Amino acid sequence: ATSQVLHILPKPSYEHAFNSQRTEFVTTTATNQVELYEQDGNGWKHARTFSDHDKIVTCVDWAPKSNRIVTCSQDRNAYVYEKRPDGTWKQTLVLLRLNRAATFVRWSPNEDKFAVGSGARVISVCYFEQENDWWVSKHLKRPLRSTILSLDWHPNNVLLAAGCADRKAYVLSAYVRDVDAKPEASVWGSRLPFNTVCAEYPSGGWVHAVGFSPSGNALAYAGHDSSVTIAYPSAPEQPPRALITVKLSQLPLRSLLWANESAIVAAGYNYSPILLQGNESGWAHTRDLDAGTSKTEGPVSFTALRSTFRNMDLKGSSQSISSLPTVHQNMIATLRPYAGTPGNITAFTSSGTDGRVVLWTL
Amino acid sequence: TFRTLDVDSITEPVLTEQDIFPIRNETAEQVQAAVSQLIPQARSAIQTGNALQGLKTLLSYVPYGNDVQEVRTQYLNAFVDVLSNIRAADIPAFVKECSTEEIDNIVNFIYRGLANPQAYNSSVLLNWHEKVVEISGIGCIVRVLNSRPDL
Amino acid sequence: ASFNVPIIMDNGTGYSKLGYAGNDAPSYVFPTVIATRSKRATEDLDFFIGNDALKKASAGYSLDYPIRHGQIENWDHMERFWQQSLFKYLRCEPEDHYFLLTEPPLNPPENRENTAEIMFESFNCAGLYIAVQAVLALAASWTSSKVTDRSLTGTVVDSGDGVTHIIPVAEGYVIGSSIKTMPLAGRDVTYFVQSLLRDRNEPDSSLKTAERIKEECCYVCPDIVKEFSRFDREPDRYLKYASESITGHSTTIDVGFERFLAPEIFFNPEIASSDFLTPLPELVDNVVQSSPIDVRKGLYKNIVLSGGSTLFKNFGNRLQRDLKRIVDERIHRSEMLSGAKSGGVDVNVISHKRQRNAVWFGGSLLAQTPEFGSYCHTKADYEEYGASIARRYQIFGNSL
Amino acid sequence: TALVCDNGSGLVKAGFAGDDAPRAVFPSIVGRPRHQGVMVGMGQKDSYVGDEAQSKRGILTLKYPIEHGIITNWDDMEKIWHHTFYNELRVAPEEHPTLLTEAPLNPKANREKMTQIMFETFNVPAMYVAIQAVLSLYASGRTTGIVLDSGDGVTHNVPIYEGYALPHAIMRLDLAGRDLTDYLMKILTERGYSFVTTAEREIVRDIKEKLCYVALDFENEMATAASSSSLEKSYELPDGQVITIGNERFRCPETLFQPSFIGMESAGIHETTYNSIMKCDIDIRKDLYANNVMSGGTTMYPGIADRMQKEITALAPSTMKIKIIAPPERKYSVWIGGSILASLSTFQQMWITKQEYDEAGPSIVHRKCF
Amino acid sequence: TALVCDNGSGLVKAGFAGDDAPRAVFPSIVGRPRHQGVMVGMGQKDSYVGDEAQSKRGILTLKYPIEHGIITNWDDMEKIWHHTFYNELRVAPEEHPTLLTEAPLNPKANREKMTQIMFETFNVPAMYVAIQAVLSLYASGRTTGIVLDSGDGVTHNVPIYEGYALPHAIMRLDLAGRDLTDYLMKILTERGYSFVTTAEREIVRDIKEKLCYVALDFENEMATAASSSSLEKSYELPDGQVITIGNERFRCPETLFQPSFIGMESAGIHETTYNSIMKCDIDIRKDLYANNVMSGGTTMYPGIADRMQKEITALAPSTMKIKIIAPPERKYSVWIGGSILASLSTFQQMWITKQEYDEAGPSIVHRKCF
Amino acid sequence: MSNTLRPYLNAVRSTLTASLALEEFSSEIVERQSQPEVEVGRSPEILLKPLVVSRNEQEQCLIESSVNSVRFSIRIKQVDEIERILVRKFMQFLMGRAESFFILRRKPVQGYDISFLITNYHTEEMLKHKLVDFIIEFMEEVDAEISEMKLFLNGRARLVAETYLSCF
Ligand SMILES: Nc1ncnc2c1ncn2[C@@H]1O[C@H](COP(=O)(O)OP(=O)(O)O)[C@@H](O)[C@H]1O
Ligand SMILES: Nc1ncnc2c1ncn2[C@@H]1O[C@H](COP(=O)(O)OP(=O)(O)O)[C@@H](O)[C@H]1O
Ligand SMILES: Nc1ncnc2c1ncn2[C@@H]1O[C@H](COP(=O)(O)OP(=O)(O)O)[C@@H](O)[C@H]1O
Ligand SMILES: [Mg+2]
Ligand SMILES: [Mg+2]
Ligand SMILES: [Mg+2]
The missing domain is CATH 3.30.420.40 (ATPase, nucleotide binding domain)
Known part of the structure; x- marks a missing residue:
């Protein structure tokens, strides 16, 4: 797998999103700001900040077809950003009605609603009313017992998966009338009203990541125990066909993405994207996409003269501290499609706590 | 004065460990009998000089629960005694043939051993820790951090 | 507590005053300075302090003042200063004696913690009281120790x-919300005298010569544009000061407008500093007007002066007249709204025979009290709780 | 940041700690007019410094305040230091620590007056004197x-x-x-050319800086120049007349290897x-x-x-x-290494400070700068 | 396994009982800087010991704590023992019993103080002091x-x-x-080579180890070396200078057979x-x-x-x-024999144990050891 | 120093490096605030089980761990009363500098000699492999540091003895 480092951000990057044309990306720095980056030849340039949040921004997402950015923060708010004709962005506060921080945000596949995970034991499913010119929030709350660490939407607009700090992965209906048309019958159910519970799958550690299969017929999720579990449902009120856990030898995956119906890429505290492959008969960790998993006299500049004396003075010796062998130098926080049709992701991007934004080609 | 009165402990009851970890589907006397069948096999395997099979049989079941400290400490006494009687050259060949669940149980019980040095020899538990982590990787300790508190 | 006399140590930025409770003066008054060297290692034994450190600059020792702007900032040097105070000068055993220490009202929790561990673990004193320093200077103002002579309400500068x-104290309680501090005192007026000798290119501008010109030549005038004009009108206003150099020969210095312009640092601190702007009479007004209404007459009726840098000729009279101006202009604004004359308030600024060392004399008078050993930390408290016992602020309101 | 001022005998080299090279580099010269100032106004000055003296030199007596690494004229050295801070670096010296330099085995009083002028004239917050090597x-x-x-x-x-x-x-x-340069004036006189004034001493310094070089074997080069045109080449004066020189190109630098050429009794470099x-x-x-x-x-x-x-x-x-x-x-390299030193974190504790000078006088330099 | 040290008067030999040779062999030397560090951020240390003192010797004064088999400097001996444990063998002294070693007819205080330091400073579990012979x-x-x-x-x-x-x-x-070594420094002077410093003594020790030998008949060898250059050899100093050596090559070791060469009234070996x-x-x-x-x-x-x-x-x-x-x-062979002794099963009751020391004090060593 | 300490410091290194999978996490009990959850303990689902690594009854680690924070606490070798004094005072100078060693606590947890708190922010703003290298290099050297301090104390006791006893 080829990798290219697109940019190095000055501060940590728990989330990023590209637009549909991959011509700009938005990223959450560790502050209350969000950074918008545009192309600059083969490089990238900081086009503008957003700074409407009061406390640390936790997550950000960019809607492909409708070209809107949604942002979430420890200030308990969300803002939706929409493009004006003159090229500036219109902010819009969304009243999430959360008692604690917003922790994670995702746009729905039809982009008519988004969901915000929280530390408040609830998920704010947010949709727009043209009759009021308001974004309004519905709380999913019945089975959720702790911080929601991650969200994913089923390819049908109704079902929401959630990874939770109570060591469970939930599948919940986020069906909203006068936004959704009725969902088709599925392996998760057919009688599917708001906050109906399709699964409460267990984990060995906090569920950092969740992801539906490209067909929607299975859920992968990743735990803080350094495992990926893949769940194949049977029917409502019935146990799964298979509930396959693969246990990794590395530090935990924080993020997770189906490459196709039979393969998953995952990454996290191991600093490296891994590939898992399988089906309802069994799953295995099959490759590491970073070759760095294998642990792989002339004139001298003023900045080398000065830094070797600063290293002798501040540290033990002149010798510079070496890079980690992986491309990411710190945990890789998010893992997102970049190229190929849905069901056949050909390339994906990652961003990390080291501020690298990196493109990976399978 | 009011500042010190704990209202949160009665107005918002926090999650218990059994809300996070599923309840044990066996009674205290049922697990105490199951371990009391295994400890004599583990002791007997030392006398025949087959301490590797002593661990492989002892490791086939593990006690857990806050209601079973007496039989958990008896199982830990047998576990540290078995690990102390395996030859240090046999460890690499045994660890590579353990399942991920047997490895998870070994690295969990060497951790219970390392917590009490006045009872248990740390020198052999650290030698086992080096070899189990070298062969099976860091994720086996990550599974111990994430493990149940009444193991 | 032990029946041995408590030991009093006021460690100032300029001077340390050392002695025993109940004496008619400190046993020692010498600079808070340490002279330090800059096959067994002994360079931490080789130091000197006080008057004996001033003698060691020609022998290649580096002098330093471990207390600057009121706060201890070198705990190596302050520990060596205290061990030499205890074993050379006071010639005492800490295990037999209770100690009275001092520091400014602002001083960090970290400083009282660091002080307690040196006193209880390095020296092992029987007990320690770290006093609020200008609260002792109120007690030195009494005409005698008898209860009928006490004035438990007064502002102390x-x-x-x-x-x-500037500390407001009323009925013996310190109103900690109303403390004001100006970061400028006797050293900043020396650096200003030194800077003026240096601007004239005078033969000597050593720190001792600028100090001696404060103590002998300087005074507080009514107004610096009138006093600059008096130095045109009258010729004997310029003095001649005879100084002897570090290498041992005579010099003569003309001393001029620094005689009045250098003590003006208190009454116009915009001369000294970019960072502090409020003059001392307005700063004393801000202390009494932030203080509770029923104690304001008592706080103006008894404004006690303390510390060596209040001893300038005419200092208390300039403070009294400028504060009386501020106070009566505020009262008259109210008489002119109401259409009736007030009783006024008398503003009295008090200079007294013990003013030079009022903190030490107060510490001596308060450590003589039969109850004193109950207000100390005992070493038995320190054996349970450690240096955290001294960390909580005494003067200010604490949360928790 | 801190200033680094390598105030050498011939060039002042100055700039900031952590910079790749000095951003102020100028002649260590004060020039004063030697002629009748007849036109009223005309932007005239009582004296000129550095590149302003070097460009006006045809009407100025030029003098260096520093000779053999020792300050001989403190009034003109203050004039040069003022030019470094206010004209050439454009800084308040009261805002910046200054690393100064001198050669070893200098008079003690040079270090003392240099620290005194920095703290008392230029009001500096901190300073240090480093040995140039x-x-x-x-x-x-x-x-x-x-x-x-x-x-x-x-x-x-x-x-x-x-x-x-x-x-x-x-x-x-x-x-x-x-x-x-003085020896190049003495030997240029033998080929036909007299350079005599303090202004003409700058022309022959510029000849030395681009015509002169060191021979690998002096007696072979001396014989090669005595028997061929091949070592000879030329220079053009401000007046547009041309100077041709030959063995003078390597005889001048050979004085570093043979100090007896200028009458010194010392080993060569x-x-x-x-x-x-x-x-x-x-x-x-x-x-x-x-x-x-x-x-x-x-x-x-x-x-x-x-x-x-x-x-x-x-x-x-x-x-x-x-x-x-x-x-x-x-x-x-002296300035470059001063910008390294002035940017190190232990060196931030080694400065003489204003407060510490005010307490000790100019003798503080002898017990802190070695 | 026990530790064993020959704390020799010139080399430390240290290691574990049952091994064939010492794990650590190094100079029984502490070196201290004689010059001032002008360079900031250098790895300057208060003292150096063993091979690091020997490597840095051009800037250090070098001292041996042991003279004539007697510990004359206990602070430098404690530095050497701390270096044996924590730097050379890199084991904590509380973990292994240590066999130390001594010459016969020593001061009784040398062995008591060595015992007191091991049990109370290094907190060893047991120790013994054997005679080297x-x-x-x-x-x-x-x-x-x-x-x-x-x-x-x-x-x-x-x-x-x-x-x-x-x-x-x-x-x-x-x-x-x-x-x-002292005598070879003295008799090198008569051929015109001056070795004076504590570091030049280590060069002369290396000359003695590389070139000296014992002459089977001294007067025939003196007559041989007076007759021809065939007994002469050359040594190259760290300076790249060469010294040549002749009768002083065997007249040095003859001091063992003729102690009167160094002026002492005693029988040869x-x-x-x-x-x-x-x-x-x-x-x-x-x-x-x-x-x-x-x-x-x-x-x-x-x-x-x-x-x-x-x-x-x-x-x-x-x-x-x-x-x-x-x-x-x-x-x-002293260390090899100490490794044999500390490895014997019949020796394991002969150690002085810590529990047996602190009921008797350091005089326990005079009744448990020869 | 690491031949005797090697098995122990390998177990400490491996489990400290497993434990430092930290993350940004805001409080579930207080709004608009984040806290190091290992240090407050008010929400138990985001606490990981506390692990003890030990060489000896006297030489021990406690590793306490959470979604956004690790607390690491150590008992160090103190085989005599000189070492009990020397260790306690050395740890007090080291914890008195805790603002400049950003992962130190200002106080140890009870029954431990020194303690460290590594938070999410330290794993974001510092090289976390160099944080565990500093912890293990501290554990490797502190016994050699303290033993050298009791040599300096012995050397001074000789200085005053020889100075005193030589002026009769
Ligand atoms: N007669 C005086 N007139 C003015 N200032 C004086 C006089 N006598 C002493 N001082 C100054 O008082 C200051 C010392 O006062 P002191 O109370 O001992 O200060 P501190 O307690 O803070 O060390 C010094 O600046 C000293 O020069
Ligand atoms: N290219 C060169 N060739 C020969 N001499 C040179 C050259 N460049 C500079 N110099 C000479 O070096 C001297 C200036 O060197 P510099 O290091 O700046 O001295 P300083 O520090 O003492 O002022 C002048 O004599 C100048 O003519
Ligand atoms: N090859 C040799 N030839 C001659 N002398 C030697 C040789 N090797 C070592 N020496 C001498 O012996 C000393 C070391 O011998 P050793 O038995 O280890 O003595 P010690 O036990 O007192 O330290 C050296 O310092 C040197 O004086
Ligand atoms: Mg004072
Ligand atoms: Mg120069
Ligand atoms: Mg020997």
Whole structure:
């Protein structure tokens, strides 16, 4: 797998999103700001900040077809950003009605609603009313017992998966009338009203990541125990066909993405994207996409003269501290499609706590 | 004065460990009998000089629960005694043939051993820790951090 | 507590005053300075302090003042200064004696913690009281120790070498919300005298010569544009000061407008500093007007002066007249709205025979009290809780 | 940040700690008019400094306040330091610590008046005086070596082993680029050309800086020039008339190797370097020979590093590798190494501070800057 | 496993019992800087010890804490012991019992203070102090013999018969390797080479180790060296300078056979060895003569066992055989024999234990050790 | 120093490096605030089980761990009363500098000699492999540091003895 480092951000990057044309990306720095980056030849340039949040921004997402950015923060708010004709962005506060921080945000596949995970034991499913010119929030709350660490939407607009700090992965209906048309019958159910519970799958550690299969017929999720579990449902009120856990030898995956119906890429505290492959008969960790998993006299500049004396003075010796062998130098926080049709992701991007934004080609 | 009165402990009851970890589907006397069948096999395997099979049989079941400290400490006494009687050259060949669940149980019980040095020899538990982590990787300790508190 | 006399140590920025409770003066008054060297290692034994450190600059020792702007900032040097105070000068055993220490009202929790561990673990004193320093200077103002002579309400203006702070105390309680501090005192007026000798290119501008020109030549005038004009009108206003150099020969210095312009640092601190702007009479007004209404007559009726840098000729009279102007202009604004004359308030600024060392004399008078050993930390408290026992602020309101 | 001011004998070199090179570099000169100032107004001044003196020089007497590394005129040196801070760097000196420099074996009073003027005239917050050859070793990326530094007024050798200087083995020689300029005036007079004024001394300094070089073997070069046109080449004066010179191009620099050409009784710079290595303890000599570091503008001649290596190889035993380190930036190595030092975090504790000077007087420099 | 140290007067030999050779062998030296560090951010240390003191010696004054087998500087000996434990063997001293080693006829205070420091400063679990010559029989596989042990500080004879020592027949001579280095520095001066410093002493020690030998007949060798250059050799200093050496190449080691060369009134090593045999009971002498064991670095000279057999054959009665066992590993035989002794199953009750020390004080060593 | 300490410091290194999988996490009990959850303990689902690594009854680690924070606490070798004094005072100078060693606590947890708190922010703003290298290099050296301090104390006791006893 080829990798290219697109940019190095000055501060940590728990989330990023590209637009549909991959011509700009938005990223959450560790502050209350969000950074918008545009192309600059083969490089990238900081086009503008957003700074409407009061406390640390936790997550950000960019809607492909409708070209809107949604942002979430420890200030308990969300803002939706929409493009004006003159090229500036219109902010819009969304009243999430959360008692604690917003922790994670995702746009729905039809982009008519988004969901915000929280530390408040609830998920704010947010949709727009043209009759009021308001974004309004519905709380999913019945089975959720702790911080929601991650969200994913089923390819049908109704079902929401959630990874939770109570060591469970939930599948919940986020069906909203006068936004959704009725969902088709599925392996998760057919009688599917708001906050109906399709699964409460267990984990060995906090569920950092969740992801539906490209067909929607299975859920992968990743735990803080350094495992990926893949769940194949049977029917409502019935146990799964298979509930396959693969246990990794590395530090935990924080993020997770189906490459196709039979393969998953995952990454996290191991600093490296891994590939898992399988089906309802069994799953295995099959490759590491970073070759760095294998642990792989002339004139001298003023900045080398000065830094070797600063290293002798501040540290033990002149010798510079070496890079980690992986491309990411710190945990890789998010893992997102970049190229190929849905069901056949050909390339994906990652961003990390080291501020690298990196493109990976399978 | 009011500042010190704990209202949160009665107005918002926090999650218990059994809300996070599923309840044990066996009674205290049922697990105490199951371990009391295994400890004599583990002791007997030392006398025949087959301490590797002593661990492989002892490791086939593990006690857990806050209601079973007496039989958990008896199982830990047998576990540290078995690990102390395996030859240090046999460890690499045994660890590579353990399942991920047997490895998870070994690295969990060497951790219970390392917590009490006045009872248990740390020198052999650290030698086992080096070899189990070298062969099976860091994720086996990550599974111990994430493990149940009444193991 | 032990029946042995408590030991009093006021460690100022300029001077340390050392002695025993109940004496008619400190046993020692010498600079808070340490002279330090800059096959067994002994360079931490080789130091000197006080007057004996001033003698060692020609022998290649580096002098330093471990207290600057009122606060201890070198705990190596302050530990060596205290061990040499205890074993050379006071010639005492800490295990037999209770100690009275001092520091400014602002001083960090970290400083009282660091002080307690040196006193209880390095020296192992029987017990320690770290006093609020200008609160002792109120007690030195009494005409005698008898209860009928006490005036438990008064403002105290303390001005030493490093810092000046104005403390309101009423019925013996310190109104900690109303403390004001100006970061300018006797050292900043020396650096200003030194800077003026240096601007004239005078033969000597050593720090001792600028100090001696404060103590002997300087005074507080009514107004610096009138006093600059008096130095045109009258010729004997310029003095001649005879000084002897470090290498041992005579010099003569003309001393001029620094005689009045250098003590003006208290009454116009915009001369000294970019960072502090409020003059001392307005700063004393801000202390009494932030203080509770029923104690304001008592706080103006008894404004006690303290510390060496309040001893300038005419200092208390300039403070009294400028504060009486501020106070009567505020009362007259109210008489002119109401259409009736008030009773006024008398503003009295008090200079007294013990003003030079009022903190030490107060510490001596308060450590003589039969109850004193109950207000100390005992070493048995320190054996349970450690240096955290001294960390909580005494003067200010604490949360928790 | 802190200023670094390498106020040398011939050029002031100045700038900021952590900068790649000095951003102020100008003649260490004050010029004063020597003629009848007849036109009223005209933008005239009582004196001129640096490049302003060097460009007006046809009407000025030029003088350097510093000779042989010693300040001879403090009123003109204050004029130069004022020009560094206010005209050339455009800074308040009261906002910045200043690293100053001097040659070893200077008068004690030079360090004292230099610290006094910095604290009392320029009101500096902090300052330090570094030995110039110790600074030049940081610019080499080295912590052991012998530094041969030669400026305008002084040449010196300082041996350092693993960060320890050997102060008994330090050599000074009051012969450098100004003595070579004076000697070039004395020998240009033999081919037909007289340079006499303080202004004409700057023309022959510019001839020296681009015509002169060091011969690898002086008697062969002297015989090659005596028998061919091939060593001869020319220079154009401000007046547009042309100067041609031959053996004067290598006879001038040879005075560093043969000081008797200017009447001095001293070893040349090669043998003075060897004598400094031989004053050091026997185990350190091998690493000094492998680390001969060249510095200052008088080391900028073509062929001087090849000559220095040839000459030291004849003095040392053949059993070891002599290496001469002559960076192309060695014109500025004292300043470069001052900008390294002034940017180190332990050095932030080594400054003489304003408060500490005010308490101790100018003698504080002798008990803090070594 | 136990630790074993020969804290020799010139080298430390340290390691674990049951190993074939010392794990750590290094100079029994502490070095301190004599110059001032001018360079900021350098790895400047308050003192250096062992191979790091020896490597840096050009800037250090070097001191040995042991002189003549007696610890004269306890602070530098504690630095050396701390270096043996934490830096060289890199084990905590509380974990292993330690076999220390000593010369016979030492001050009783030397062994008590060594015991007190191990139990109270290094907190060792158990320790023992063996005689260096007794260990040299364990290494040699003997239970009968007379050991001539000669290290850096002391030369001694211990006669042993069938495991019994004869402590009245033990001889000490405060003349060994350091006295031969002192004398070689003195007699190098007469060929015009000056070695004076504590670091030049280490160069002269290396000259002695590389080039010196024992001459089988001194007056024939002196006549040979006066007749031709064929006995002369060359050594290259760290400076790359070459020194050439002649009769002083064997006249140095002859001080062992002629102590009057260094001005001391005593018998040479052959006569102290014979006098030690003649102090023994008449029946054991015949077996001691056949079992002369040589040990320590000052017995490593080429020709010394041939000289020693020649001289003992001239002293002893011609009716019986003289044999001298000078093995090639004899440089480490004290440590090798200590590793054997501390490894014996029959030795494990002979250690002084910490619990047995702190009911008796450091005088316990005089009743548990010989 | 690491031949005797090697098995122990390998177990400490491996489990400290497993434990430092930290993350940004805001409080579930207080709004608009984040806290190091290992240090407050008010929400138990984001606490990981506390692990003890031990060489000896006297030489021990406690590793306490959470979604956004690790607390690491150590008992160090103190085999005599001189070492009990020397260790306690050395840890007090080291914890008195805790603002400049950003991962130190200002106080140890009870029954431990020194303690460290590594928070999410330290794993974001510092090289976390160099944080565990500093912890293990501290554990490797502190016994050699303290033993050298009791040599300096012995050397001074000799200085005053020889100075005193030589002026009769
Ligand atoms: N007669 C005086 N007139 C003015 N200032 C004086 C006089 N006598 C002493 N001082 C100054 O008082 C200051 C010392 O006062 P002190 O109360 O001892 O200060 P501190 O307690 O803070 O060390 C010094 O600046 C000293 O020069
Ligand atoms: N290229 C060069 N060739 C020969 N001499 C040079 C060259 N460049 C500079 N110099 C000479 O070096 C001297 C200036 O060197 P510098 O290191 O700046 O001296 P300083 O520090 O003492 O002022 C002048 O004599 C100048 O003519
Ligand atoms: N090959 C040799 N030839 C001659 N002398 C030697 C030789 N090797 C070592 N030495 C001398 O012996 C000393 C070391 O011998 P050693 O037995 O280890 O003495 P010690 O036990 O006293 O330290 C050296 O310092 C040196 O004086
Ligand atoms: Mg004071
Ligand atoms: Mg120069
Ligand atoms: Mg020996």
